[PDB]
Design an enzyme around this catalytic site. Sequence first.
Site, PDB file in Angstrom:
ATOM      1  N   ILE A   1     -11.452  -0.791  39.075  1.00 36.87           N
ATOM      2  CA  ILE A   1     -11.081  -2.078  39.233  1.00 36.87           C
ATOM      3  C   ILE A   1      -9.617  -1.997  39.513  1.00 36.87           C
ATOM      4  O   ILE A   1      -9.007  -1.591  38.704  1.00 36.87           O
ATOM      5  CB  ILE A   1     -11.433  -3.173  38.345  1.00 36.87           C
TER       6      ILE A   1
ATOM      7  N   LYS B   1      -3.407 -12.756  36.504  1.00 39.93           N
ATOM      8  CA  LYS B   1      -4.393 -14.326  37.116  1.00 39.93           C
ATOM      9  C   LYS B   1      -5.544 -14.324  36.771  1.00 39.93           C
ATOM     10  O   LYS B   1      -6.346 -14.980  36.902  1.00 39.93           O
ATOM     11  CB  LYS B   1      -3.764 -14.391  38.517  1.00 39.93           C
TER      12      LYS B   1
ATOM     13  N   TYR C   1     -14.037  -6.514  26.088  1.00 37.00           N
ATOM     14  CA  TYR C   1     -15.361  -6.031  26.322  1.00 37.00           C
ATOM     15  C   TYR C   1     -16.330  -6.398  25.252  1.00 37.00           C
ATOM     16  O   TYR C   1     -17.495  -7.084  25.621  1.00 37.00           O
ATOM     17  CB  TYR C   1     -15.334  -4.565  26.554  1.00 37.00           C
TER      18      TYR C   1
END
Lengths: 204, 204
Positions: free
Chosen positions: B129, B138, B175
């Site tokens: 990612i 953001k 997570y």
Amino acid sequence: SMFSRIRLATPSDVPFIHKLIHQMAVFERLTHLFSATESGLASTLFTSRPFQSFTVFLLEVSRSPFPATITSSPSPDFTPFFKTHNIDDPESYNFSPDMLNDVVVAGFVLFFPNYSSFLSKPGFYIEDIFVREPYRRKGFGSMLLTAVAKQAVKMGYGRVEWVVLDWNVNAIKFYEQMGAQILQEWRVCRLTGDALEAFDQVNI
Amino acid sequence: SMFSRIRLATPSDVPFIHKLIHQMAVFERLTHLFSATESGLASTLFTSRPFQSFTVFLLEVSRSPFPATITSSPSPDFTPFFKTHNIDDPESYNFSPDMLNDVVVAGFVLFFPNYSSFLSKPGFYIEDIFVREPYRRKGFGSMLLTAVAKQAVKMGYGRVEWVVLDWNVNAIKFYEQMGAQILQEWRVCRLTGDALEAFDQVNI
């Protein structure tokens, strides 16, 4: 002499894949995790060509030589692997792809492509290797791992990867002897079950 | 208002994928590992349909609303994800899939199917990612992860997995808050380079 061969699985091999996964679960005392079905395997494992997605190599054994080739192999990039080895198998009848021929399925490796962004090159990730009990203690687990590595080289793939238990000191040393490296910094994260299903509610 | 959308990448997006991977390497100070080419990406990432093998979601942003749909999406199982957010981008011209439209590519997630033998069910593994610098801080990295999880649920896939650095305490807690579990017992093993190429010599 016992002859062995490693070939690509095809849809007709689903019963043997199902039973090998079950024996793997029994071996590990993890059968409470087993929900695999023949239909589930048949509808998920073969939606792509070999090496395109999930791929299974099957190990087979015989007291007589195997054919030198498989002309109907489901991939043009694959020829079988072979070894000769210098045994009671009560389950033989549940593992014979042709009932009249003296060949039985002895194990499998399940793997699928992974990817290195920095290389723009695919590799293989090995998920499971299992050899059933009458053929254990003969080096077939290593033979199946070697088969995946050799296939990666033939196809120009960049890496082969898998996981190992932190305490499995003998396997770690074995992998290091092969030239593999244990990447000590990474930990696997898993999202599953109701925690995964809850993402249905995220408003995106 | 800044509008965002997450869609499937297609072959025409190769220049943007290439540049995003490069910026990821620059960000990590790992550019000595970068050998990706547009041709390499184009010939490896798109040999299967979305979700069949390697899949890329692209994050795009715009000061004006996106269309509600993508009718030409390369998968029937996918509709885009959207978010509205309440910025100087000098690189905009290198990240605009249509030069005249006010839309720029801001990030990506690369993932591919994995498999659970015990479930006879595929899952997804997230490999990378990356969100480029003007759109950092953001929440877009989390948005891209959420997109993969939501897609897994829509498709009935069993698990989403990835790796995390052992010392990345803030990501680990993040997570866990999502309901993911860090599997502390596993270590990743990698066979690559000359060590992998040596398997060419094994006599099987």
